């Protein structure tokens, strides 16, 4: 079958940057535009949703997830990339949930997401 | 609940000559109070001039004789010579020492010619220790044969008496005798009688008869 | 295993010239009760080797596949070997002795005989390792009412006819039905000459307790 | 320990009640013995206090964690299989015995859950210390399908009878309703019993007691 | 079973018995009780015969590998703290051992007991065996630091023989080592039955 | 048990805005007693306190390592802790050893940062909370304790007369307990201040 | 596979470790970050390389982390690799307290992250922590 | 408990008793022993009540995996070696009396017996759980070669009407079911259709 | 068993161990020290399991001076007490359980003299005196009857004086000797061996 | 140029290259025939030296009482082959208490060298063996290749300038199946001189001779055993 690399394909360049992570933000900038906008009592979430005839069926996927009672989540890019971090938050939240028997702080659970 | 034992009698010995080496054992198989089967030799030849006797569990004594068999023949690629009697005594302490935490049940009798071309017997307990003997019995009549030899071969307790070496002819006749007053007063030692003669010559089998009660 | 559930009872086993010849008993008792009638406690290992099994009738079933498929792959290659029945037989010993290093035995006490290059082979097999070939055999609680009258027989003469012997074993199995609390009275008889393996189906035993009325007078 | 289900013709009834003893000596008086499992799915426990706590709470993750992904309600079935194949996993050394009930988009469900792993899918459950008490009011006053308030009146009045004739069991009873539109967890429901008013003041006051040091620290 | 083992000021004299039993059988009257570990190491043996056997036997291996790299002879001090850790791995498990390490050093003659139990003491006067209580009495009435080569011998001699004369499982031969600066000398095998009518009359 | 190996006291009690939790003090190996002065109430975090009594190795390691989850969280996080959670937290803790348990009981006394709402509460051995309103005791003594404060307690009470109950509230049950006794600590928290005194007892 | 390793962890004909050279030019990108000692204290100052007008600020400090209640560090780099560093001495100087009983002094710290940052330029081929 | 299973031509005819014993209280008195693992294969668990419940389980997960990989009923034959498997692995563990029969569309109806010690074994009648010992005689004088199914599904009746009467772990109700090429025709005997013999 | 004795002055702390290594009737050894320098200002008195303390005695010793040579600044005493007792307390629960009981009696230069107690559980306690062995139930009276604060080092080894001839007295064992040292702000120094001549 | 770097690699062509080159690994070793008969199989080497001082590597190797081989390629993987064969007969004294019939012994390096050509970065086993042994079918003879085939045959020849050895074997192969023990290694010393060059001849300080048979276990012949086949032997004229 298989054993995997193990060397990093992300790696310095003579300038000082790590080319993968500039190009993968050139990816984010091809996908469908998202804003963002915290009010004083609520945040909104809106997204422009893929389509592209009238045979696709505009309810059977979200561009808008729910990843906690009180957390949410939009994304700009690769759609499959992006149900793998919904996934990966998801059971975040319920490994913190499971040991402080506490909704996960949104501080908290981005700063985790961003370490996976 | 389960007993990896048992105990399966047989009586071996082995006489230490000056150009020979005798090992002789009975032949009966017996468990608990049934006689198994009546031939079975615990006799098996190792090299050309080495005999190994194991007596005890029987179950461990055909996994022992096909370990020192194997790695026999594994130290004969390695080194292009055949081992010789007082190497197999040592390597057989290792093997019998692996297991020290559920150990074989057997206890073994080497005798063959060392190098020089001497007699040479070599007694192991179950967990595997030494010395080199000039005559050892072990087994279950055990305690009957080590006085008769002790005696007659040792000298011990006597005066005034010879010290002219062990004759082969004296020794088959001496080994003959004292498995004949075994067979009368311990019931696991009967049927027949291997008496292996370890000349510089090879290995004769001589096969005797006991009394089968 | 540590405790046997079902269990058959003894196997009886005797060489003559030219084939060896098994019996048992087809019944499968589980504790008093005899509670599986027609088991079948002989295999057939390949077209010269059988085998009788004694002891936990799960651990047997458990060989049966095992042997079965290290069979059949001998007969893949096709490349004119076999396993002899001395093979088998060896190969059954490492089979209990391993078992009982990890202190979690075969239960079983097993015949295997079989006839290969003119010449009979009949071993015997503890669970503890124990193994050895005679002229006769019987496992079990046949070790005390069989084994004398076929080991008197092969006092007198060592050599059998087959007629001899197939007499011989339903004289024993007899014995056992009376004295035994285990027994039954369909038992089958296996045969191997250089015919092969014959495998005679259910036999009854007639007994007579013409004894029955002694008891008082 | 009491717990009892009951299914009606809405949905579920389970009935606790809320004395936890540490050996003979009643450690709290008001325990919830119900437990949130997913919004439509309550779940009673038994047995060892601190199993089902740490059971309950790994199958509500486990739960509404695989809400989120289907996208509907979780059913009454799938928590009656993580219980089940959890508890069998480890050879019932968790001494957790539960009373899982829920309504399902498939009627509602009732379920026992024992230590071993047995699930038993029954009308009426009983389970804990007691429970033999109740079950006796069950099977004298039990008839398949009744109003919404002869199941009220019904489970507690059977949490009732091993209150007062079990020890291990007493103070409130805790009911709670599912039905396939509302969930009504009431805590309490009765108070069965109330202990009485002291008959003097046996406290005292300003310097009872020696003192032999006094630091004080302030903070901001 | 009884070995004992004194330093004094030209060495170290190590002395043991030979009987060993099976139980109130004797299996062999000649056991060898001290190992030649290397020729300059001595080693005893009385707990179990397979158990100090196959470990002394492989401390001889551990200090002959340590000579080669080191390029110079292991410290008595030394190889008692290796075999030492050999043995603290099975603590519990059910050994028997019962050795001395005895040689002479860079800081002179040393004398070491090892045990089954993870002891590790130098001293100057050791017994170690079923007759061990037998020997330290008749040897600390006539043990002294200084004595002549020639009283040391005997003081040995007679310490194992009375030990073997009480105890039931001590007897045989009395084999008896002089581990001398450059190495040890066997220096006699005598036997009980002959220092049994040396010291009658 | 063997969690009389070395005998302990803990008790905590609510006041209306003040909680107050006493402990005894004395380390000693079965009988004998090794040394006067062994705390057994720890800060964790300002006004929320937790007594651990019991085996007194786990009292220090659960000390320990439950310093070490609370460190590490009120870094990573900027927030300090809540004292529902520091139940909930410890809960965890002594869950994870499921089989072989530590033989600590932990009680938290304490506080709400954000207003100072109080709140106490006890655990089992192997961790189940258990969060009350009136008192919570765990120790050899338990018994004594219980029925001690159950007729000694008044729904509210200030920091002048909490401290007048809960110090004789234990005087009188770990006097009437062999292995306990020998100088009680308690300390009262209010939103203000946290005062410490220790009380006079029997050094017998 | 062997063609697609970059082979970061291998000496340069010249005697240097090309990937730990470029981190440092990575370096000199990130926001300016000075500390001074004094006899009375010590201070950090950093300059936000981040500002804008709809950023926020929810956090004390967006580049002064405190690793301890007696330390804490400034950062300059890939701020990613940032939050993985001071996670790791965090936990290296809870692991100090959890052994000795004493907060950890202040040099071990520093070095018991050099190992760390150091081991991956050594062996494994992951790119250097920048 | 006490389980029962017999071969006519068509197909086979199981029958159980409904009580779940706990020592001397009965946790649950309308319980369901037959329980389906495919189509036409049931088993008859009676033993540990929560070991069995494993077993079923882990064989329905296999034994239905293993008929859409193939396309084909699987044999009845196929789903008893399964329990073979899973009883004798564990045969520390667990304490499991199978009785796994069902239709076959090529070897008719077959019923296997997978004792505690996980034997295996096909039988014409076979009659398991611990209420079992008290008909060995009247099931070995009534069978007799070749029925029909209202032959039989009187016939287990009668049997687990009398195990019922002496032993004290069965009780309730009982459950038969036909299994036959047509499908399975469940039934229960309650009240007065239970078979009576007071004397 | 054995016997240590720690007795914390106000600027120095003065310990005492008996010198015997028996096994069975007989002592094997009678100068037999059980003090381990794991510094220049630390002393870790041992005693219990034969095997064990010289095991974890090693082993602590050998990381506490590894920690003086990498940064180069002694542990404090009651850093080296706590790092013990966390050892100990590891191996509580797992296949190779310590069974020591041991004093950790050092100097600090900023918080002065120290004494700790462990037993063989791992119960960590700082105390101004401790004993252990059975002969800590006849000395740890004395101990309290004589001992305050204040105490020159004068009267502290004419108190432990009399704690060892009681041992002589109403004891049952041998002990004939006492190995002292003290530990101050210069180092460890040895002092004369209180000894009982039986002679 | 850039299929020959790994044996995982498929040429366009539709071969592999490493496992071509393996086998010139083998071509580079020095000659050895096998001939059998129908009683007897016989292993004849060309030993050879690196030296004038030096004595010549052995080329037959003893693995159980009826099995010998004889190596040509790497002699550091000839050993690790030989005590994997070593091993598998002691495997079946031990279980089965027979010999270890030859062509499931063949059927074993078989399924051991066809691993590593096709896992990444390892390489096949440079050397080629022939494999004269003797059981229940009489005589065989069995090479092996690097490339993880086998054969058998009724006289094969490896190594170098091998291929004027197979024409001699192959014009006298229907001669072998009547001959005695002694006739026949007269054959297989008369192959093994074509492939000397033409300018010195078999001595006794570089053949190696090793005969199985039927009653005979498997042994080998070197310095002064060689002399009793050696003399007698035809002269071969230019």
Redesign the interface.
Known sequence: AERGYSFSLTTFSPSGKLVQIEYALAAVAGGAPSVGIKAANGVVLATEKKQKSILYDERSVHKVEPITKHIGLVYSGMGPDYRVLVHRARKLAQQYYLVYQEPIPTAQLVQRVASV | RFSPYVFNGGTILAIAGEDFAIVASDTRLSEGFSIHTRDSPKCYKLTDKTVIGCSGFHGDCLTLTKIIEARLKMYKHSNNKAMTTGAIAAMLSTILYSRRFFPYYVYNIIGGLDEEGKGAVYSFDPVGSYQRDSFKAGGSASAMLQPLLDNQVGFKNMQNVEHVPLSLDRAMRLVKDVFISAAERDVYTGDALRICIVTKEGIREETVSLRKD | TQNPMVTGTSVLGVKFEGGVVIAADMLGSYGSLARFRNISRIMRVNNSTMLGASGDYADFQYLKQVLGQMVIDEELLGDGHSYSPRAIHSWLTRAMYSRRSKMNPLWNTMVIGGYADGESFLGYVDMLGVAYEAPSLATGYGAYLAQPLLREVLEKQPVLSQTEARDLVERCMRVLYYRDARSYNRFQIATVTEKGVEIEGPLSTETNWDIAHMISG | TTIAGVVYKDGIVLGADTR?T?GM?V??K??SKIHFISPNIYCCGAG???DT??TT??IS??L??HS??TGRLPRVVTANRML??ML?RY???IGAALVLGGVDVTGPHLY?I?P?????K?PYVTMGSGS?AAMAVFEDKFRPDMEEEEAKNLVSEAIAAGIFNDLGSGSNIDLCVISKNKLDFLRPYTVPNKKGT?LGR??????????????????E | TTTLAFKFRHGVIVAADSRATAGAYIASQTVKKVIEINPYLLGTMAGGAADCSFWERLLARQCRIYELRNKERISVAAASKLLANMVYQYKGMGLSMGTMICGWDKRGPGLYYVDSEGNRISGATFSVGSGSVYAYGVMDRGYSYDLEVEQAYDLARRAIYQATYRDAYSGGAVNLYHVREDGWIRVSSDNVADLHEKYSG | SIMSYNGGAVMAMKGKNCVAIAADRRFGIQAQMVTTDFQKIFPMGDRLYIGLAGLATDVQTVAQRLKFRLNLYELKEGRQIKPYTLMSMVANLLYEKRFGPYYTEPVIAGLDPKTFKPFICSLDLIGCPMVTDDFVVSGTCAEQMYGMCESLWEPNMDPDHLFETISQAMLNAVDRDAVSGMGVIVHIIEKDKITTRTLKARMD | SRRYDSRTTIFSPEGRLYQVEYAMEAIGHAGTCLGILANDGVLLAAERRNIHKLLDEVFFSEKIYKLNEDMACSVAGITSDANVLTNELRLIAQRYLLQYQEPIPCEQLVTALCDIKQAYTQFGGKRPFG | TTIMAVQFDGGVVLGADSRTTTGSYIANRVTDKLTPIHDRIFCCRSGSAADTQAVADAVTYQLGFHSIELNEPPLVHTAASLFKEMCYRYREDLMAGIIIAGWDPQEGGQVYSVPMGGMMVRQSFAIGGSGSSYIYGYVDATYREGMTKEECLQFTANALALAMERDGSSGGVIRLAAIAESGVERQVLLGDQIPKFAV | MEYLIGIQGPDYVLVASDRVAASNIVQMKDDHDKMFKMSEKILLLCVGEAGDTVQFAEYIQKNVQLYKMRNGYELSPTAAANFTRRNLADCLRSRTPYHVNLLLAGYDEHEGPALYYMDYLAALAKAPFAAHGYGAFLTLSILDRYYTPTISRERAVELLRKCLEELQKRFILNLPTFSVRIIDKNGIHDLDNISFPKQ | NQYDNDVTVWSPQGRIHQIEYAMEAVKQGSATVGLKSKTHAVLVALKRAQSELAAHQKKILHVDNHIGISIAGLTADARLLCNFMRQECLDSRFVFDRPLPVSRLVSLIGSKTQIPTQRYGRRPYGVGLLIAGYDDMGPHIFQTCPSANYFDCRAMSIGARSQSARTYLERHMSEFMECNLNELVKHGLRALRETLPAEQDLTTKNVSIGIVGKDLEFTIYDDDDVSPFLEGLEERPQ
């Open positions: 936890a540490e000596v450690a709290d008001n325990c060892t206090a601190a706590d740490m709470q790994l993750s486990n509404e964690l989120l992904s089940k194949q069998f050879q019932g050394y026992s024992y071993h792993g047995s699930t038993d029954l033999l002291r046996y406290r005292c006051e300003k310097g009872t007691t020696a003192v032999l040091t006094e630091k004080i620290t302030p903070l």
